[PDB]
Every structure is written in C-alpha cells, then in structure tokens.
Amino acid sequence: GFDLNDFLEQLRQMKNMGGXXXXXXXXXXXXXXXXXXXXXXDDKVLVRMEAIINSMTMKERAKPEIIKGSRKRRIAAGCGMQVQDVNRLLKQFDDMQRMMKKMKKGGXXXXXXXXXXXXXXXXXXX
Amino acid sequence: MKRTFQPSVLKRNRSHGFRARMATKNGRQVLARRRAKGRARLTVSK
Amino acid sequence: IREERLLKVLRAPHVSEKASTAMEKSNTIVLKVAKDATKAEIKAAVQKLFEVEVEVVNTLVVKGKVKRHGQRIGRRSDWKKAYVTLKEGQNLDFV
Amino acid sequence: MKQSTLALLLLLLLLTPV
Amino acid sequence: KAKELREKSVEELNTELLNLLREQFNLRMQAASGQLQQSHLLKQVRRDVARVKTLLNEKAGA
RNA sequence: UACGGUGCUGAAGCAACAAAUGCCCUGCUUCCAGGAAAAGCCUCUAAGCAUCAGGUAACAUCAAAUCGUACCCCAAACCG
RNA sequence: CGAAGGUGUGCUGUGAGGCAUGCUGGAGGUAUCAGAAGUGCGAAUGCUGACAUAAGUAACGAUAAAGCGGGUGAAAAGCCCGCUCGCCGGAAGACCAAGGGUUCCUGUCCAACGUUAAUCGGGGCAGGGUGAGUCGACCCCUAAGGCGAGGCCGAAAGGCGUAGUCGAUGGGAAACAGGUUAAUAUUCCUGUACUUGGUGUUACUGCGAAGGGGGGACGGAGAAGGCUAUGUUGGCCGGGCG
RNA sequence: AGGACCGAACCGACUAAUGUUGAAAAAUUAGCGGAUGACUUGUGGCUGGGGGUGAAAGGCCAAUCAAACCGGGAGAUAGCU
RNA sequence: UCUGUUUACCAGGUCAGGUCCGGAAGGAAGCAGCCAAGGCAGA
Ligand SMILES: [Mg+2]
Ligand SMILES: [Mg+2]
Ligand SMILES: [Mg+2]
Ligand SMILES: [Mg+2]
Ligand SMILES: [Mg+2]
Ligand SMILES: [Mg+2]
Ligand SMILES: [Mg+2]
Ligand SMILES: [Mg+2]
Ligand SMILES: [Mg+2]
Ligand SMILES: [Mg+2]
Ligand SMILES: [Mg+2]
Ligand SMILES: [Mg+2]
Ligand SMILES: [Mg+2]
Ligand SMILES: [Mg+2]
Ligand SMILES: [Mg+2]
Ligand SMILES: [Mg+2]
Ligand SMILES: [Mg+2]
Ligand SMILES: [Mg+2]
Ligand SMILES: [Mg+2]
Ligand SMILES: [Mg+2]
Ligand SMILES: [Mg+2]
Ligand SMILES: [Mg+2]
Ligand SMILES: [Mg+2]
Ligand SMILES: [Mg+2]
Ligand SMILES: [Mg+2]
Ligand SMILES: [Mg+2]
Ligand SMILES: [Mg+2]
Ligand SMILES: [Mg+2]
Ligand SMILES: [Mg+2]
Ligand SMILES: [Mg+2]
Ligand SMILES: [Mg+2]
Ligand SMILES: [Mg+2]
Ligand SMILES: [Mg+2]
Ligand SMILES: [Mg+2]
Ligand SMILES: [Mg+2]
Ligand SMILES: [Mg+2]
Ligand SMILES: [Mg+2]
Ligand SMILES: [Mg+2]
Ligand SMILES: [Mg+2]
Ligand SMILES: [Mg+2]
Ligand SMILES: [Mg+2]
Ligand SMILES: [Mg+2]
Ligand SMILES: [Mg+2]
Ligand SMILES: [Mg+2]
Ligand SMILES: [Mg+2]
Ligand SMILES: [Mg+2]
Ligand SMILES: [Mg+2]
Ligand SMILES: [Mg+2]
Ligand SMILES: [Mg+2]
Ligand SMILES: [Mg+2]
Ligand SMILES: [Mg+2]
Ligand SMILES: [Mg+2]
Ligand SMILES: [Mg+2]
Ligand SMILES: [Mg+2]
Ligand SMILES: [Mg+2]
Ligand SMILES: [Mg+2]
Ligand SMILES: [Mg+2]
Ligand SMILES: [Mg+2]
Ligand SMILES: [Mg+2]
Ligand SMILES: [Mg+2]
Ligand SMILES: [Mg+2]
Ligand SMILES: [Mg+2]
Ligand SMILES: [Mg+2]
Ligand SMILES: [Mg+2]
Ligand SMILES: [Mg+2]
Ligand SMILES: [Mg+2]
Ligand SMILES: [Mg+2]
Ligand SMILES: [Mg+2]
Ligand SMILES: [Mg+2]
C-alpha cells in the first residue's frame, strides 16, 4: 500500500521539482475559493519534511501508526525541531494516505470528480 | 385493523379548506376566533 | 417580447456532472432561471443575450430541500432549471 | 501523466488549504 | 448622484436604465461563476436602477 | 482496461402445434328487474352576408403554453 | 477585614426558636418598635419535577436458516465481495392510482435514532437528481350534488330555487422501437411517425346558431366461432464431448 | 333458467387453542359460512345531536352513544367523602 | 569463538539528511543507515 517510505520518495521527488508560483497557478478552481497566497514556502517545508522523514527508523517509516509520544520526542530531537511540526507532518501524511486510499478504491476520475471545496455559510470566507 | 383516518386531500380541502370556511357565517367566525388566538395556520392548505 | 424582461429571466448557469455531460454529448447548456419564466421567454432570452441559436428548451422545477440549522427547521426556496438545446453549429461563449 | 498529475496536484494543493 | 440624473431627459433616462440592467445582469453572471470579487458592485447597481425608475416615475406623474 | 467497464465486430433469426379470463365483442342469442347525461363530431337551415366573409383539397410555414414527472406503494416511506 | 443561602459544631429558652462560630459562598442583609399578610404542610387514589423499587429480572416483534473464505476497519455473527445453503414465486416479484414529501443517488460521519454490535441504514452533514405538441393534470362536456343574478320565503342571521355557473369516479385530438445516466426517460439521444390549430399560396366554391335532426348512448345472463398474447417441440445457429 | 349446487380471489366471522403489562386498544393458527347476488369494492355526494340512520341489536354516528364532540353559562349543585 | 539473522528514544563509535553558535573560519547535540553490542539460532 502507502507508507512514509513511499512518502519519503514522493517527498525527495517533490522537493526537486516543486515551487509554490508553478503549483498555485496550474489551478484557478481552488485559487478563487482559498486565498491565492496560502500555498507555502516550498523549500523550507520540504527541507523540514525530508529532515523529519529521514530522522525516522525504517520500521517507523514503513509503519507510521507506531509513532507515539516518545517517538515524536525523538524525531523532534534528531532533526532539531518542534514536536508540533512532527505532529502536523504525521497529520499531512495521514490526509494524503487517506487520499491515496481514496484514489486506490475509487477510480482516478470518480475521486477527482467528487472532491469538494466548502463554505460554513455561502457568504465569502464565513 | 381499518382505523378511522383514511387520508384524501380532496375531501380534506372541500371539508375544512379555507374557501369552505369562507362559505358560511360560522366559517367566517371560526376564522375570526383563529386570527384572534393568533394561530399559525388557520385552515389546512398545503 | 421586451428586452427589459429578457435581462431579468436568467439567474445563473447551473453546474454539475450531469450538466457538463449534456454540454459535451448533446450540445446543451443548463440554467437556473426565473421561477416564473416560460419556455418562450427563455428561448428568446438566450438567443439574444448570448447571441446563439436555440433549437428547443425543456424546463423542470427543483423542489427545495428541508434542512435543520441549529435545531430550527428551514426550507430552501424552490427554483426552475432549464436545459437549453443549441443548434449543432453553435459554439458556446461565456461572458 | 494521469496519476503523476493527479498525485502532484492534489498533493501540493490539498497540502495547502486544509 | 441623483441630481445628475434629474437633469437628463426621459429618453436618456431609459437609455441608462437599459445599460444599467445589462451591467447588473452581466455582473450577477460573473458572481454566478465565482469569477466576481467585488460584491459591493451588485448592491450599487441594483440601487442605482431604483434611482432611475423613481425619476422616470416622477416625470410621468408630473 | 482505473477490473468498475469502454471499444470494434456479431452467427441464425424459421416451421408446426397448443392456447387464454386478452382481442373481433358497445357484436350475437335470450331474459326482465327494461338498463346516465352533455360536449367534440356529421348534416339542416334562421338571423345575416354575398366577386367580401366562409367552406373543401394539396404544398409550404409557425405554434402546441402552464404545472406533475425523483422515490415508496401486498410497505421499515401510506392508515395503525 | 466576606452579606443572603448552603453545611457542621458549640451555647441558650417551657416551646414555636434564638445567639455564636469552622468550612462553603461571593453581594447583599437588617436591629428596635410599629403595620400588612399569597405567613408556617406529611397525608387530600393532591399537582409539577427528580430519583428509587421489583431487577440487571421479563423481553429484543412471526420456527423462511444459515455456513465458510477474502475485504475494509479501533474493533466484523449483522457491512461489502465470492462459493455454497434455505425461503417467496397469483408474491414475500414487476408497474401505477391514493397518501407521503426527498425517504432517491453519491461522498462523508457514528454522539443520539436502529430493541444488540455497526465500518451499515429509510439515522447526521454536504453535494447531486425529477427534461414531454402525443403520459397525467390543466382545458372542452355534463352525473349525483353544490353555489345561485333576479324571485318566492322567513323575529334577525337565514331557508328554498330559476337563469346560470361549478362539480369526475364517466365522454372529448394524436408515439412507438432501440440506445444511454452513479440516480430521469413513451420526456434526452438515434430512427421512423402522427394530431389539432394560426398564417399564406393555389384550386374550387353557399357560408352562417345559444335553434332542428343524427351520433356519441350505454343492462344482465349465456353461447361458441375466428385470432393473438403466450408457451412447448422440431428445424436452424453458436458452442459442448464433459 | 336459478337470491341452485361444489370450490379459490373476494366478503364474512361459527368452534378450539394461543395471546390477556399482546406481534395487535379485538389479532394469529387450525378448521368453518356465502361466493351471479337482498353480492362485493373504488372515487365522489347527501342525511347533524330534543337530530340523523337502523333487514331493529338501543345498533351506528372518528378506538367516545338510553341522546356525539368542542367552547361557553360555570368556581352549576353536592344534608356526601 | 566464525556464519545466519534480530534490538525505535532513553548502552557505544561513525554519524548522511536536517538543526543550534559564527559575517567567515569552522565547530556542536545528534535522529536514520552501517559496525560493535545485547536477543535467538547453524557449528
Ligand atoms: Mg382513502
Ligand atoms: Mg424536445
Ligand atoms: Mg415539464
Ligand atoms: Mg422560504
Ligand atoms: Mg458487444
Ligand atoms: Mg374475468
Ligand atoms: Mg380480468
Ligand atoms: Mg419519470
Ligand atoms: Mg419512476
Ligand atoms: Mg393491498
Ligand atoms: Mg410489493
Ligand atoms: Mg417490494
Ligand atoms: Mg455571618
Ligand atoms: Mg430577603
Ligand atoms: Mg449563613
Ligand atoms: Mg469563611
Ligand atoms: Mg455564612
Ligand atoms: Mg471564594
Ligand atoms: Mg424593615
Ligand atoms: Mg432574616
Ligand atoms: Mg408583626
Ligand atoms: Mg398558603
Ligand atoms: Mg395532618
Ligand atoms: Mg398508585
Ligand atoms: Mg427543570
Ligand atoms: Mg436494579
Ligand atoms: Mg425474579
Ligand atoms: Mg427467570
Ligand atoms: Mg411477554
Ligand atoms: Mg428470557
Ligand atoms: Mg427480529
Ligand atoms: Mg466472514
Ligand atoms: Mg463502537
Ligand atoms: Mg469476517
Ligand atoms: Mg443473522
Ligand atoms: Mg452474501
Ligand atoms: Mg419454495
Ligand atoms: Mg402524490
Ligand atoms: Mg432526511
Ligand atoms: Mg439508499
Ligand atoms: Mg446501537
Ligand atoms: Mg452511504
Ligand atoms: Mg440518509
Ligand atoms: Mg391523453
Ligand atoms: Mg344541476
Ligand atoms: Mg337574491
Ligand atoms: Mg340553493
Ligand atoms: Mg363546467
Ligand atoms: Mg378522470
Ligand atoms: Mg378521459
Ligand atoms: Mg430508478
Ligand atoms: Mg342533439
Ligand atoms: Mg359510458
Ligand atoms: Mg342487449
Ligand atoms: Mg401465434
Ligand atoms: Mg455442434
Ligand atoms: Mg348452501
Ligand atoms: Mg375489505
Ligand atoms: Mg381463518
Ligand atoms: Mg372459505
Ligand atoms: Mg360454496
Ligand atoms: Mg357498485
Ligand atoms: Mg333528549
Ligand atoms: Mg341541546
Ligand atoms: Mg344493516
Ligand atoms: Mg365508536
Ligand atoms: Mg343531545
Ligand atoms: Mg365543581
Ligand atoms: Mg349560574
């Protein structure tokens, strides 16, 4: 299936090619609903991302749900960073694992057609 | 078994429907009492 | 028909997979239109405002749902959807 | 291609708005 | 506005009425697609229409 | 082939017999308890109108609105 | 520098009570003497609310029935997929009217709802879905019946009814076969039709009604003659030699 | 031919058992009566309480009937508890 | 004691990536991978 080794590969392949002005322009469908400026700083987020993924042992990378409080302490200590960044990175891998399972079960055109952008009420951003 | 209320819209309306109340003196008095008691819906319509 | 009326009938293009597929396959567009608008009005209106030639217009009426917001029970206002068929040599402008 | 662009788009993109 | 409009004839009034409507329609078409940023636009135009008609009317009555 | 489907092609496509409560039948035969109405429809004229108006045929043309249309209906959606 | 209340304790009166203080509480209380009461609760098969008891008992709604592998998943007797097995089959299948009103389809969610569990649902939230000249209503026409200009009748309101106008469960123009959607189709699409009007053209020509006539127009029972729907067999066609 | 016979749909409701805080405020199971008619069933309409309607049981009139239900007179009246 | 393989952080060494100090020179703590090493085995 999908692992943080496969996310390691997706990430050292994506930190090579990627930019935030070539990625926020290839879509004008979610550059109208979300602010055109909310992309990221790609170099920093993918260098932190590759740092945090590299700090992992091979059994924590191949199986991402065995990572708990002590392991996040240690991933924060080896890459010299915050337990909160490690947290929200295990959370983005959680969502993209969710989405590659939803591309796996349903066809590429049914999981690209039923994808939804939302407003809590129809007024802009509110 | 066969219970009392067997619904039919037509019957419902020709009986207690608004115009059927606008038929008679006592219809119009029921409507008065109803507005005076500040009823949400006077008759059954829709 | 008068123009001050035509401008007031077409609310907004309705989007969907159904709509899309009709556009591609059947050369049809889908519109949220004034609830009271009639096939004649709609025909004339799209023919004028969008400068295209219409073949025929089929209309239906969406019944609003009934939703709960913070326990109160509301009802979305109903509306009229219209599938408008364009003659085959007609290309689609969006202004 | 198809799964390369559907990966890459939804990845950089849905990394962004959530 | 509304003085500037009081100073135009019945003819030019209806002309600007029409143009105002075209503008409003076009607007709500854009906003329909989500291709419109400025919402305040709507409420300007719509109000403006009123101005116009209310002038036409007082030219018709007196 | 995303294993969901999509694409192209595609044989033979008959005879007998059986047979309804369905169709011929708003028929037919018979009985007494003797079996709705009004429009469209076909025709007659009156008032009228007469190379006008109007009627019939063929060809062309335009029109045919408005609402219902999902789903449940021997039921977990209806009356209990 | 801690009121009312709440809650312990101490002291005191013959009693209804009083006084003091520990904790709680976090802004109000009130001597004295008067005045006025919605002034004192254990009962009323009293009223409202809360919580016990029986009791972790009876029950989990037809005795048509399940079993296994795999999937997902925090967790699978119930979900999904597969192989078996069992039940309905003049219904427990298919299509409508009545009535309901979004229960339909797709994502998504598992607190409450589901007499259990729930990853499931007619449950929650979001989105999507209902395409007509020929289906039905609308409309043309009347039945029973309703309403009823005038009119007759009546202490008053009102009662009856004419001319009329409404009223279907009945009469009145016409579309079928195939293809398609995650969810509509005689409506979309492909093909082939048909109907009644408006306008014109032509040819021809007595046209006209709220009036006359015909038609629409009609029971029960029975008989059995002609067919079809439809099915079986053969033939044909493709496959199978298990 | 027939308020003829035998028997399903349909209509009923004779006997038994079950059930009786029911699966259900009148049912289920097993049998039983009529089943071309004084039959049954749909949609609509009419009959209003000192009244209706009754192949007549004081039956039925929205699970209410020897005088329906709803509001009013009304805090009826209660030598009774 | 050779070879087969096991043990995230919290025994050791190398410590990539990344991160701290510095303008720069360079250091530094150290996660992963590897080797000790500790589990369990072929001899
Ligand atoms: Mg009924
Ligand atoms: Mg069409
Ligand atoms: Mg329609
Ligand atoms: Mg509203
Ligand atoms: Mg094929
Ligand atoms: Mg028969
Ligand atoms: Mg039959
Ligand atoms: Mg339909
Ligand atoms: Mg349907
Ligand atoms: Mg039935
Ligand atoms: Mg059924
Ligand atoms: Mg069924
Ligand atoms: Mg005190
Ligand atoms: Mg006080
Ligand atoms: Mg106190
Ligand atoms: Mg204190
Ligand atoms: Mg105190
Ligand atoms: Mg305190
Ligand atoms: Mg005082
Ligand atoms: Mg006090
Ligand atoms: Mg006193
Ligand atoms: Mg008292
Ligand atoms: Mg006592
Ligand atoms: Mg008691
Ligand atoms: Mg309370
Ligand atoms: Mg107990
Ligand atoms: Mg016991
Ligand atoms: Mg026991
Ligand atoms: Mg019991
Ligand atoms: Mg038990
Ligand atoms: Mg059960
Ligand atoms: Mg299993
Ligand atoms: Mg659970
Ligand atoms: Mg299993
Ligand atoms: Mg089971
Ligand atoms: Mg199965
Ligand atoms: Mg069987
Ligand atoms: Mg309905
Ligand atoms: Mg709902
Ligand atoms: Mg469903
Ligand atoms: Mg439960
Ligand atoms: Mg679902
Ligand atoms: Mg639901
Ligand atoms: Mg018809
Ligand atoms: Mg009459
Ligand atoms: Mg009068
Ligand atoms: Mg009358
Ligand atoms: Mg009529
Ligand atoms: Mg009818
Ligand atoms: Mg008819
Ligand atoms: Mg369907
Ligand atoms: Mg006649
Ligand atoms: Mg007839
Ligand atoms: Mg006869
Ligand atoms: Mg045949
Ligand atoms: Mg062969
Ligand atoms: Mg007998
Ligand atoms: Mg019955
Ligand atoms: Mg029986
Ligand atoms: Mg019997
Ligand atoms: Mg018999
Ligand atoms: Mg009858
Ligand atoms: Mg009496
Ligand atoms: Mg009385
Ligand atoms: Mg009787
Ligand atoms: Mg009763
Ligand atoms: Mg009485
Ligand atoms: Mg009393
Ligand atoms: Mg009195």
What ranges do the domains of chain C cover?
1-95
- The number of C-alpha atoms within 13 Å of B27 and in the hemisphere containing its C-beta is 12
Return the CATH number at A29: 1.10.260.30
In angstroms, the CA of B14 and the C1' of G144 are apart by 16
If one counts every other C-beta atom within 10 angstroms of the C-beta of residue B6, the result is 7
Contact C87/C55 with Cβ under 8 angstroms? Answer: yes
Domains of chain B with bracketed CATH: 1-46 (1.10.287.3980)
Q: Which chains touch E (3 or more CB pairs under 8 A)?
A: A, C
Nearest to C11 by CA among C44, C28, C36, C48: C36
Rg (CA), chain C: 15
Domain count, chain A: 1
Measured distance CA(A120)–CA(E16) in Å, rounded: 39
Measured distance CA(E4)–CA(B37) in Å, rounded: 53
Nearest to D2 by CA among A111, A40, A18: A111
Instruction: Show the DSSP H helices in A18-121 as ranges.
Output: 20-23, 42-54, 58-61, 69-78, 83-105, 108-113
Nucleotide with C1' nearest the C39 CA: F65
Burial C46-66 (b: 16+ CB within 10 A, else e): beebbebebeebeeeeeeeee
Domain residue limits at E50: 1-62
C-alpha angle E45/E51/E53, rounded to 5°? 105
Domain count, chain E: 1
Which technique was used to obtain these atomic coordinates? cryo-EM
Measured distance CA(C45)–CA(C49) in Å, rounded: 6
Measured distance CA(A106)–CA(B23) in Å, rounded: 62
Measured distance CA(E30)–CA(E33) in Å, rounded: 5
Which helix (H) or strand (E) element contains residue B13?
A: helix B9-16
Residue E57 phi/psi, 5° resolution? -55, -50
Shortest distance, CA C9 to any CA of chain E (angstroms) = 10
| SS3 of residue C66 by DSSP | strand
Measured distance CA(E32)–CA(E28) in Å, rounded: 6
CA dist list (Å): A105 to A3, A57, A122:
16, 29, 31
CA dist list (Å): C38 to B5, C34, C94, E22:
40, 9, 23, 21
State the burial class of residue A60 (Cβ atoms within 10 Å of its Cβ: 0-12, 13-18, 19+): middle
Contacts with A74 (C-beta within 8 Å, 6 or more apart), sequence order: A55
Nearest to C32 by CA among C66, C79, C71: C79
Which one of D2, D6, D17 has the shortest CB-CB distance to A34? Answer: D17
Measured distance CA(D6)–CA(A97) in Å, rounded: 14
In angstroms, what is the span from residue C39 Cα to ligand 44's centroid?
22
Interface present between C and E (3 or more CB pairs within 8 Å): yes
Measured distance CA(A52)–CA(A90) in Å, rounded: 10
Domain residue limits at A45: 1-126
Contact A95/D14 with Cβ under 8 angstroms? Answer: yes
Nearest to C94 by CA among C66, C52, C60, C57: C52
DSSP A25: S
If one counts every other C-beta atom within 10 angstroms of the C-beta of residue E47, the result is 10
C-alpha angle A60/A62/A63, rounded to 5°? 60
Measured distance CA(A45)–CA(A51) in Å, rounded: 10
Top residue of A13, A14, A20 to mutate, by most chain D CBs within 10 Å, is A14
Measured distance CA(C81)–CA(C60) in Å, rounded: 5
Resolution (A): 3.8
| Breaks in chain E after (C-N > 2.5 angstroms) | none
Nearest to C14 by CA among C92, C79, C69: C79
At the topology level of CATH, where does C1-95 sit?
A: Alpha-Beta Plaits (3.30.70)
Instruction: State the pairing for strand pair C54-62/C66-69.
Output: unpaired
User: Which two structure tokens, joined as six digits, stand for E22?
Assistant: 């075209």
